[PDB]
């Protein structure tokens, strides 16, 4: 309460600073948005296999995009970057991070322990140990406090939509996490209850529905077209009853 406002203020400031360079993939000679999407979708499955938190996954994606903003990587090394990133994010965020040997195992011995650990050193060097990054998830959990009592379906659906945004660099790298979270939460609230981005959050965040509209337009499309996307691990994840099967709910056809 005292410092909840301050935390929000502080995260709004760091999300600008921990942003990756928006067009970095154009400047990568051997890798694409499509290969990035494959990697992230695979990280979702790793998160599921090891029962890691959603925050861990979101932090890993932040680390990867930041690293690829300044370092050239060949396609056969892209998974090594992702593995080291997930390991680092686990250490930061989890009570019981999986051990390195388990991470080697889920690559199906594509890399060695030595390679993963050297890449861990290199990612830390390139990011200058700045791992405490704001994520979509950190903003979501705050936004959720402004619906009382909590609607667990809305929360799971918002998380689902926020997770899908990680998959596609175009267009989601051009939005800030706080904005994606806002779009996600409005969209989830609307789909399940008919309600909109509440007055209390307009005051807290300074965002109106209209400032959210461009991101909300993209996220609506991503949601509509999710069953036909090449990557499906998130949709599969959110079919489970742990997430109230929210990936099975029908997206609204219009938002007005």
């Amino acid at each position: 309460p005292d410092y909840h406002e301050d935390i929000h203020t502080y995260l709004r400031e760091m999300e600008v600073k921990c942003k990756p360079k928006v067009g970095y993939m154009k400047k990568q000679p051997d890798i694409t948005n499509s290969m990035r999407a494959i990697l992230v979708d695979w990280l979702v499955e790793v998160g599921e296999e090891y029962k890691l938190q959603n925050e861990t996954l979101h932090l890993a994606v932040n680390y990867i995009d930041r690293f690829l903003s300044s370092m050239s990587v060949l396609r056969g090394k892209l998974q090594l970057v992702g593995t080291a990133a997930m390991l680092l994010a686990s250490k930061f965020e989890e009570i019981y991070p999986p051990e390195v040997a388990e991470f080697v195992y889920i690559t199906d011995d594509t890399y060695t322990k030595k390679q993963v650990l050297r890449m861990e050193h290199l990612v830390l060097k390139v990011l200058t140990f700045d791992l405490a990054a704001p994520t979509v998830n950190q903003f979501l959990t705050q936004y959720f406090l402004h619906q009382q009592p909590a609607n667990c379906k809305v929360e799971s659906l918002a998380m689902f939509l926020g997770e899908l945004s990680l998959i596609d660099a175009d267009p989601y790298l051009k939005y800030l996490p706080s904005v994606i979270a806002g779009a996600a939460f409005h969209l989830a609230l609307y789909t399940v209850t008919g309600q909109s981005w509440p007055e209390s959050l307009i005051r807290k965040t300074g965002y109106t529905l209209e400032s959210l509209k461009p991101c909300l337009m993209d996220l609506h499309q991503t949601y509509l077209k999710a069953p036909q996307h090449a990557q499906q691990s998130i949709r599969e994840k959110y079919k489970n009853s742990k997430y109230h099967g929210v990936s099975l709910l029908n997206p609204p056809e219009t938002l007005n």
Binding site: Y3, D6, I7, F92, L117, D130, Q138
Partner: protein
């Protein structure tokens, strides 16, 4: 690391070893925290990852300053500013005559500024104790050792249970509450406040049960009225003895009304009603701080 000369072993921290050292080219005196990486074979430890990442977000006069991180293939060194004394040692050297009241107030005020800042930047320290609080010859005091720290969320999830050194550990941890947060840091500062005034640890337990009973004997065994939900907590036992609360003029005899009031609010049982670092700074106890 060629350019640092080791002067003396300061001690062992939350992990690895600390040395006082001198930069042979500049003259600058630093403290070096060494971590051997080859003796873990699990990469850079989480303790180190968190301390470094969170300290780079925590620039404040009452938080110890991280200067550089030197990352060999074989070793990892954190290079910090050097301060000449810790609070534990300062209390030992003032064990008879007492730390004067204005200096106790000044140090508590500074500790609270440092801690409010941590909490404002979503960091829990989780190992506040006199050994980790560093004083310079200028009269400043600083929070140090962020190896047990973690970045928290709003609202919190369940976090690691094995936290805070026993004597400074809050009752919500000891009793196994599913959630804990900033209040655990305030409890620790409350214990430190009282320890500065009386010249001995407030709650020097030798087990989790002994620790709880020492807290109970001083503050009264909590019941459903003072702390709703307490008798239902995982490690709460109905056989716990029911002690009555001691008058705060026996607990902390040298303190005025304002002092006693602030301590009682820092050691409030219900973590929801325990005073924040921010509100503690606005307490009347501090109206004459220097």
């Amino acid at each position: 690391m060629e350019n640092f000369q080791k002067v003396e072993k300061i001690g062992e921290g939350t992990y690895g070893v600390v040395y006082k050292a001198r930069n042979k080219l500049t003259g600058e005196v630093v403290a070096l925290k060494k971590i051997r990486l080859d003796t873990e074979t699990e990469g850079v430890p989480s303790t180190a990852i968190r301390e470094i990442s969170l300290l780079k977000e925590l620039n404040h006069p009452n938080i110890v300053k991280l200067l550089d991180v030197i990352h060999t293939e074989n070793k990892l060194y954190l290079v910090f500013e050097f301060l000449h004394q810790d609070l534990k040692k300062f209390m030992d050297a003032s064990a008879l005559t007492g730390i004067p009241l204005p200096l106790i107030k000044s140090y508590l005020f500074q500790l609270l500024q440092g801690l409010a800042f941590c909490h404002s930047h979503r960091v829990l320290h989780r190992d506040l104790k006199p050994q980790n609080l560093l004083i310079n010859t200028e009269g400043a005091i600083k929070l140090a050792d962020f190896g047990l720290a973690r970045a928290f969320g709003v609202p919190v999830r369940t976090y690691t249970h094995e936290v805070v050194t026993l004597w400074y550990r809050a009752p919500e941890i000891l009793l196994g509450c599913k959630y804990y947060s900033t209040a655990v840091d305030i409890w620790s500062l409350g214990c430190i406040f009282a320890e500065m005034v009386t010249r001995r640890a407030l709650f020097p337990g030798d087990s989790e049960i002994d620790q709880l009973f020492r807290i109970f004997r001083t503050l009264g065994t909590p019941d459903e009225v003072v702390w709703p939900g307490v008798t239902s907590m995982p490690d709460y036992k109905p056989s716990f003895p029911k002690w009555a609360r001691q008058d705060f003029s026996k607990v902390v005899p040298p303190l005025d009304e304002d002092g006693r009031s602030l301590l009682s609010q820092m050691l409030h049982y219900d973590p929801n009603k325990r005073i924040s670092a921010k509100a503690a700074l606005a307490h009347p106890f501090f109206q004459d701080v220097t």
